[PDB]
Design a protein around this ligand. Sequence first.
Ligand SMILES: Cc1ccc(C)cc1
Ligand SMILES: [Cl-]
Ligand SMILES: [Cl-]
Length: 162
Amino acid sequence: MNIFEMLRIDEGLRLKIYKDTEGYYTIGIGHLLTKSPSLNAAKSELDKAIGRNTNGVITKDEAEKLFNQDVDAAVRGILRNAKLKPVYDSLDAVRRAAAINMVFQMGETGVAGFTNSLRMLQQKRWDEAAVNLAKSRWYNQTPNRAKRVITTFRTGTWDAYK
Ligand SMILES: Cc1ccc(C)cc1
Ligand SMILES: [Cl-]
Ligand SMILES: [Cl-]
């Protein structure tokens, strides 16, 4: 198991524009296109991202290309963030995958507001962090996914994904 396989499980794969859990236009493997309610705005963002007139549809290859870019970007986002970096550096390989998953899902902004969880993770207080992470809109909105990520931080294994 690795970050790509993990995220592919959590996000699925769709080759036609769709609405995410929050109702935002997305495509491929959780690639958010726009928060605007306009489908046209979404198709325009899509064409700009793929570099071609897609008509709201992409191939598997194109989806996988967006995915690679997105994972890379998340990691780099983390490494660039002064709040995040130190936490990420302190973690083991499995747990780093859980950190990347959250950043990918919610943005470095979103995750950067889990200050108290961050501190617990840095201190390696696993059970406590797990409890703290669950007290969130994130967990209440997407409970099955949050549970998987949380188990990951808690155990440092891929058990929730098998
Ligand atoms: C790097 C990192 C991001 C988010 C959390 C919750 C923990 C670590
Ligand atoms: Cl893009
Ligand atoms: Cl869920």
